[PDB]
Design a binder for this molecule. Structure first.
Ligand SMILES: CC(=O)OCc1ccccc1
Ligand SMILES: [Cl-]
Length: 162
């Protein structure tokens, strides 16, 4: 397993504009287009991202290229963030994937409230970090996704995805 297979399982694949769990227009493998309620704004964001007039539909190749850019962007966001990079560098390869997964879903700002979890992860207090991560809006709104990611942090294995 690797980060691309993990996120493909968590996000699925849809080739037409859809709404995510929060109601935001999204396409492909979890690519957020806009938080605006306007479908026309979302369609404009899509055409800009793809470079052609899509009318709300993309190919599988396009979805996979967007996904590669989005994973790249998540990793770059971790590496440029002075709070996240030291924690990321302390983790093994499997747990790094759980870290990217959370940034992909919530962004650098969505993880800003997780200061206490980050310290426990850096100290390798896995069970304690798992409990702290579950005390969140994230866990309460998307519990199955959160359980898979938390289990990955707790165990350092892919067992939640097998
Ligand atoms: C708050 C959290 O558990 O996010 C995981 C993480 C760890 C290091 C860098 C980015 C995200
Ligand atoms: Cl869920």
């Amino acid at each position: 397993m690797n980060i691309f297979e993990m996120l493909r399982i968590d996000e699925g694949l849809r080739l037409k504009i859809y709404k995510d769990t929060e109601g935001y227009y999204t396409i492909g493998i979890g690519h957020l287009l806009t938080k605006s309620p306007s479908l026309n704004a979302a369609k404009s964001e899509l055409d800009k991202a793809i470079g052609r007039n899509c009318n709300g539909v993309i190919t599988k190749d396009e979805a996979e290229k967007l996904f590669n850019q989005d994973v790249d962007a998540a990793v770059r966001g971790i590496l440029r963030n002075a709070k996240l990079k030291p924690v990321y560098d302390s983790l093994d390869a499997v747990r790094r994937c759980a870290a990217i997964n959370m940034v992909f879903q919530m962004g650098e700002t969505g993880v800003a409230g997780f200061t206490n979890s980050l310290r426990m992860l850096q100290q390798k207090r896995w069970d304690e970090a798992a409990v702290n991560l579950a005390k969140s809006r994230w866990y309460n709104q998307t519990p199955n996704r959160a359980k898979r990611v938390i289990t990955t942090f707790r165990t350092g294995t892919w067992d939640a995805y097998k």
